[PDB]
Write an enzyme that holds these catalytic residues in place. Structure first.
Site, PDB file in Angstrom:
ATOM      1  N   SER A 149      -4.627   2.646   4.882  1.00 17.63           N
ATOM      2  CA  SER A 149      -4.785   2.034   3.586  1.00 17.63           C
ATOM      3  C   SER A 149      -4.812   0.514   3.675  1.00 17.63           C
ATOM      4  O   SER A 149      -5.679  -0.143   3.069  1.00 17.63           O
ATOM      5  CB  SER A 149      -3.666   2.518   2.673  1.00 17.63           C
ATOM      6  OG  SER A 149      -3.707   1.936   1.380  1.00 17.63           O
TER       7      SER A 149
ATOM      8  N   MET B 167      -8.310   1.355  -5.618  1.00 23.86           N
ATOM      9  CA  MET B 167      -7.941   2.758  -5.713  1.00 23.86           C
ATOM     10  C   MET B 167      -8.936   3.394  -4.761  1.00 23.86           C
ATOM     11  O   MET B 167     -10.107   3.562  -5.087  1.00 23.86           O
ATOM     12  CB  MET B 167      -8.147   3.259  -7.145  1.00 23.86           C
ATOM     13  CG  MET B 167      -7.318   2.528  -8.207  1.00 23.86           C
ATOM     14  SD  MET B 167      -5.548   2.937  -8.165  1.00 23.86           S
ATOM     15  CE  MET B 167      -4.868   1.394  -8.592  1.00 23.86           C
TER      16      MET B 167
ATOM     17  N   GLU C  51      -7.181   9.110 -13.429  1.00 23.48           N
ATOM     18  CA  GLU C  51      -7.058   8.226 -14.591  1.00 23.48           C
ATOM     19  C   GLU C  51      -6.881   6.750 -14.246  1.00 23.48           C
ATOM     20  O   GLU C  51      -7.579   5.892 -14.791  1.00 23.48           O
ATOM     21  CB  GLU C  51      -5.909   8.684 -15.511  1.00 23.48           C
ATOM     22  CG  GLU C  51      -6.223   9.917 -16.365  1.00 23.48           C
ATOM     23  CD  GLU C  51      -7.563   9.805 -17.096  1.00 23.48           C
ATOM     24  OE1 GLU C  51      -7.741   8.824 -17.855  1.00 23.48           O
ATOM     25  OE2 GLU C  51      -8.434  10.694 -16.910  1.00 23.48           O
ATOM     26  N   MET C  52      -5.957   6.449 -13.338  1.00 27.76           N
ATOM     27  CA  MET C  52      -5.699   5.061 -12.957  1.00 27.76           C
ATOM     28  C   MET C  52      -6.902   4.431 -12.262  1.00 27.76           C
ATOM     29  O   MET C  52      -7.039   3.204 -12.219  1.00 27.76           O
ATOM     30  CB  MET C  52      -4.456   4.981 -12.065  1.00 27.76           C
ATOM     31  CG  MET C  52      -3.182   5.488 -12.746  1.00 27.76           C
ATOM     32  SD  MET C  52      -1.661   5.008 -11.910  1.00 27.76           S
ATOM     33  CE  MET C  52      -1.763   3.212 -12.156  1.00 27.76           C
TER      34      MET C  52
ATOM     35  N   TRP D 240       1.037   2.237  -8.505  1.00 28.55           N
ATOM     36  CA  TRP D 240       1.287   3.517  -9.107  1.00 28.55           C
ATOM     37  C   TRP D 240       2.623   3.488  -9.845  1.00 28.55           C
ATOM     38  O   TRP D 240       2.657   3.751 -11.039  1.00 28.55           O
ATOM     39  CB  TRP D 240       1.268   4.610  -8.024  1.00 28.55           C
ATOM     40  CG  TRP D 240       1.342   6.015  -8.551  1.00 28.55           C
ATOM     41  CD1 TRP D 240       1.285   6.410  -9.853  1.00 28.55           C
ATOM     42  CD2 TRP D 240       1.487   7.203  -7.777  1.00 28.55           C
ATOM     43  NE1 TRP D 240       1.392   7.768  -9.941  1.00 28.55           N
ATOM     44  CE2 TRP D 240       1.520   8.283  -8.678  1.00 28.55           C
ATOM     45  CE3 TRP D 240       1.593   7.461  -6.405  1.00 28.55           C
ATOM     46  CZ2 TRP D 240       1.660   9.608  -8.254  1.00 28.55           C
ATOM     47  CZ3 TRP D 240       1.733   8.782  -5.986  1.00 28.55           C
ATOM     48  CH2 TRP D 240       1.764   9.836  -6.912  1.00 28.55           C
TER      49      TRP D 240
ATOM     50  N   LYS E  12       0.822  -1.209   0.000  1.00 30.26           N
ATOM     51  CA  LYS E  12       0.000   0.000   0.000  1.00 30.26           C
ATOM     52  C   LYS E  12       0.864   1.271   0.000  1.00 30.26           C
ATOM     53  O   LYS E  12       0.482   2.293   0.537  1.00 30.26           O
ATOM     54  CB  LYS E  12      -0.973   0.013   1.183  1.00 30.26           C
ATOM     55  CG  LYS E  12      -1.611  -1.340   1.592  1.00 30.26           C
ATOM     56  CD  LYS E  12      -2.162  -2.144   0.400  1.00 30.26           C
ATOM     57  CE  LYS E  12      -3.175  -1.395  -0.441  1.00 30.26           C
ATOM     58  NZ  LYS E  12      -3.198  -2.035  -1.772  1.00 30.26           N
TER      59      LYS E  12
ATOM     60  N   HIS F 119       7.196  -7.494  -2.289  1.00 30.29           N
ATOM     61  CA  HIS F 119       6.951  -6.796  -1.027  1.00 30.29           C
ATOM     62  C   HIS F 119       7.731  -7.542   0.052  1.00 30.29           C
ATOM     63  O   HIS F 119       7.644  -7.188   1.237  1.00 30.29           O
ATOM     64  CB  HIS F 119       5.481  -6.857  -0.601  1.00 30.29           C
ATOM     65  CG  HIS F 119       4.520  -6.210  -1.546  1.00 30.29           C
ATOM     66  ND1 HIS F 119       4.571  -4.871  -1.867  1.00 30.29           N
ATOM     67  CD2 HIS F 119       3.434  -6.714  -2.183  1.00 30.29           C
ATOM     68  CE1 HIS F 119       3.555  -4.577  -2.662  1.00 30.29           C
ATOM     69  NE2 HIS F 119       2.850  -5.678  -2.869  1.00 30.29           N
TER      70      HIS F 119
HETATM   71  N1  LIG Z   1      -1.669   6.997  -9.527  1.00 25.55           N
HETATM   72  C1  LIG Z   1      -1.829   7.060  -8.199  1.00 25.55           C
HETATM   73  N2  LIG Z   1      -1.615   8.244  -7.528  1.00 25.55           N
HETATM   74  C2  LIG Z   1      -1.790   8.262  -6.186  1.00 25.55           C
HETATM   75  N3  LIG Z   1      -2.162   7.252  -5.345  1.00 25.55           N
HETATM   76  C3  LIG Z   1      -2.366   6.081  -6.034  1.00 25.55           C
HETATM   77  C4  LIG Z   1      -2.234   5.898  -7.417  1.00 25.55           C
HETATM   78  N4  LIG Z   1      -2.531   4.543  -7.770  1.00 25.55           N
HETATM   79  C5  LIG Z   1      -2.830   3.983  -6.627  1.00 25.55           C
HETATM   80  N5  LIG Z   1      -2.757   4.851  -5.538  1.00 25.55           N
HETATM   81  C6  LIG Z   1      -3.043   4.490  -4.148  1.00 25.55           C
HETATM   82  O1  LIG Z   1      -1.806   3.981  -3.668  1.00 25.55           O
HETATM   83  C7  LIG Z   1      -2.038   2.851  -2.789  1.00 25.55           C
HETATM   84  C8  LIG Z   1      -1.474   1.747  -3.664  1.00 25.55           C
HETATM   85  O2  LIG Z   1      -1.464   0.488  -3.071  1.00 25.55           O
HETATM   86  P1  LIG Z   1      -0.296  -0.545  -3.570  1.00 25.55           P
HETATM   87  O3  LIG Z   1       1.088  -0.048  -2.727  1.00 25.55           O
HETATM   88  O4  LIG Z   1      -0.766  -1.844  -3.034  1.00 25.55           O
HETATM   89  O5  LIG Z   1      -0.216  -0.423  -5.046  1.00 25.55           O
HETATM   90  C9  LIG Z   1      -3.592   2.942  -2.527  1.00 25.55           C
HETATM   91  O6  LIG Z   1      -3.707   3.992  -1.474  1.00 25.55           O
HETATM   92  P2  LIG Z   1      -5.110   4.602  -0.779  1.00 25.55           P
HETATM   93  O7  LIG Z   1      -5.744   3.351  -0.325  1.00 25.55           O
HETATM   94  O8  LIG Z   1      -4.580   5.405   0.368  1.00 25.55           O
HETATM   95  O9  LIG Z   1      -5.761   5.331  -1.862  1.00 25.55           O
HETATM   96  C10 LIG Z   1      -4.079   3.412  -3.897  1.00 25.55           C
HETATM   97  O10 LIG Z   1      -5.442   3.888  -3.895  1.00 25.55           O
HETATM   98  C1  LIG Z   2      -5.803 -10.104  -3.071  1.00 25.09           C
HETATM   99  C2  LIG Z   2      -4.557 -10.807  -3.776  1.00 25.09           C
HETATM  100  C3  LIG Z   2      -3.429 -11.034  -2.727  1.00 25.09           C
HETATM  101  C4  LIG Z   2      -2.745  -9.700  -2.317  1.00 25.09           C
HETATM  102  C5  LIG Z   2      -2.143  -8.889  -3.515  1.00 25.09           C
HETATM  103  C6  LIG Z   2      -1.475  -7.562  -3.052  1.00 25.09           C
HETATM  104  C7  LIG Z   2      -0.821  -7.433  -1.764  1.00 25.09           C
HETATM  105  C8  LIG Z   2      -0.213  -6.201  -1.359  1.00 25.09           C
HETATM  106  C9  LIG Z   2      -0.244  -5.065  -2.233  1.00 25.09           C
HETATM  107  O1  LIG Z   2       0.338  -3.895  -1.829  1.00 25.09           O
HETATM  108  C10 LIG Z   2      -0.871  -5.137  -3.513  1.00 25.09           C
HETATM  109  C11 LIG Z   2      -1.494  -6.374  -3.952  1.00 25.09           C
HETATM  110  C12 LIG Z   2      -2.158  -6.427  -5.347  1.00 25.09           C
HETATM  111  C13 LIG Z   2      -2.780  -7.804  -5.746  1.00 25.09           C
HETATM  112  C14 LIG Z   2      -3.331  -8.604  -4.558  1.00 25.09           C
HETATM  113  C15 LIG Z   2      -3.949 -10.003  -5.014  1.00 25.09           C
HETATM  114  C16 LIG Z   2      -5.116 -10.095  -6.010  1.00 25.09           C
HETATM  115  C17 LIG Z   2      -5.445 -11.629  -5.973  1.00 25.09           C
HETATM  116  C18 LIG Z   2      -5.068 -12.084  -4.518  1.00 25.09           C
HETATM  117  O2  LIG Z   2      -6.211 -12.741  -3.909  1.00 25.09           O
END
Ligand SMILES: Nc1ncnc2c1ncn2[C@@H]1O[C@H](COP(=O)(O)O)[C@@H](OP(=O)(O)O)[C@H]1O
Ligand SMILES: C[C@]12CC[C@@H]3c4ccc(O)cc4CC[C@H]3[C@@H]1CC[C@@H]2O
Length: 288
Positions: free
Chosen positions: A131, A249, A224-225, A46, A41, A101
């Site tokens: 988050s 998102m 956009e995303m 991104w 998160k 991760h």
């Molecule tokens: N283009 C972007 N700009 C800013 N935040 C973004 C983004 N795309 C995803 N995020 C947010 O970044 C986190 C991404 O999670 P991950 O590290 O698992 O990809 C989530 O945080 P929020 O839940 O606080 O919005 C997601 O909504």
């Molecule tokens: C929720 C899932 C496990 C956790 C995975 C994860 C775990 C941590 C994170 O920061 C992003 C994501 C993206 C995809 C996720 C996966 C989609 C299929 C699976 O069930």
């Protein structure tokens, strides 16, 4: 329903991911691979999109070839019925982009031996915590989150999938003194994306036209995303991710933690935080 975490070498992992660690011991990295590393998160989805886009030479259409998680294989990934990232990875043409991760304790050693370049993204803990909480509710493979108050509790001791966020950010911070690691902050990417996207380009060699950089900036924005199904994860089995509870998102903002943390929590947390990030030069912004 909601299996519990499995501890491996001191790290709490999702059952399915723990299993995947075995085949993974056979992973051979290539010298031209690029690893996206982050504590969950923190901007993984991104920065993956930015990287993929750069690799496709700014070509929006090519970036739409398939789900971000297919374009950028998830290394320790495994889910029932779905192809493990390892599988997916042998179907992926170099130069490759890989995401993970995992803490260094469990990182396939081949990636350090091969001196593979690393893009690391860090985010202030309070926001990561909020988050992650919502993410625990919508991503069915994690254990029950419980109340936000008990979760924060777990979060602090590192009793969450992938463990301590505090250790995670510090160890990769250290690694960067001796390994090619571009260490970025989520907050900075929010403040001035174009500035960060430039740092990435310099780091990965490619170099594009200012006219192109601005195009990405627009396309890699939360707005956009959020609507793009190739990056908002709304294309996976409702059994795994139920966007109706909380969308992947969610807000996309630095500082959202203030509307969830109570004053009690904020107090307990900052006390605890001052302890864990003692003799560290690492520094985070909690808003803006
Ligand atoms: N283009 C972007 N700009 C800013 N935040 C973004 C983004 N795309 C995803 N995020 C947010 O970044 C986190 C991404 O999670 P991950 O590290 O698992 O990809 C989530 O945080 P929020 O839940 O606080 O919005 C997601 O909504
Ligand atoms: C929720 C899932 C496990 C956790 C995975 C994860 C775990 C941590 C994170 O920061 C992003 C994501 C993206 C995809 C996720 C996966 C989609 C299929 C699976 O069930």
């Amino acid at each position: 329903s909601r299996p519990p975490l499995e501890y491996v070498k001191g790290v709490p992992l999702i059952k399915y991911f723990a299993e995947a660690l075995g085949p993974l011991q056979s992973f051979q990295a290539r010298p031209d691979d690029l690893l996206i590393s982050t504590y969950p998160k923190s901007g993984t989805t991104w920065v993956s999109q930015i990287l993929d886009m750069i690799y496709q030479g700014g070509d929006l259409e090519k970036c739409h070839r398939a789900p971000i998680f297919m374009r950028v294989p998830f290394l320790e990934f495994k889910a029932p019925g779905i192809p493990s990232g390892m599988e997916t990875l042998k179907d992926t043409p170099a130069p490759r982009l890989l995401k993970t991760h995992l803490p260094l304790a469990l990182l396939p050693q081949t990636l350090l031996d091969q001196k593979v370049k690393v893009v690391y993204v860090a985010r202030n803990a309070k926001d990561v915590a909020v988050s992650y909480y919502h993410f625990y509710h919508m991503a069915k493979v994690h254990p029950e989150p419980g109340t936000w108050d008990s979760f924060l509790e777990k979060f602090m001791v590192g009793e969450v999938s992938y463990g301590s966020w505090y250790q995670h950010v510090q160890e990769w911070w250290e690694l960067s003194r001796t390994h090619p690691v571009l260490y970025l902050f989520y907050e900075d990417m929010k403040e001035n994306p174009k500035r960060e996207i430039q740092k990435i380009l310099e780091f990965v060699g490619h170099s594009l036209p200012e006219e192109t950089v601005d195009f990405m900036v627009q396309h890699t924005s939360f707005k956009e995303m959020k609507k793009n199904p190739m990056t908002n994860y709304t294309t996976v089995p409702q059994e795994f991710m139920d966007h109706s509870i909380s969308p992947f998102m969610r807000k996309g903002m630095a500082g959202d933690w203030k509307t969830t943390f109570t004053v009690a929590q904020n107090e307990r947390f900052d006390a605890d935080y001052a302890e864990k990030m003692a003799g560290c030069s690492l520094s985070f912004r909690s808003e803006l």
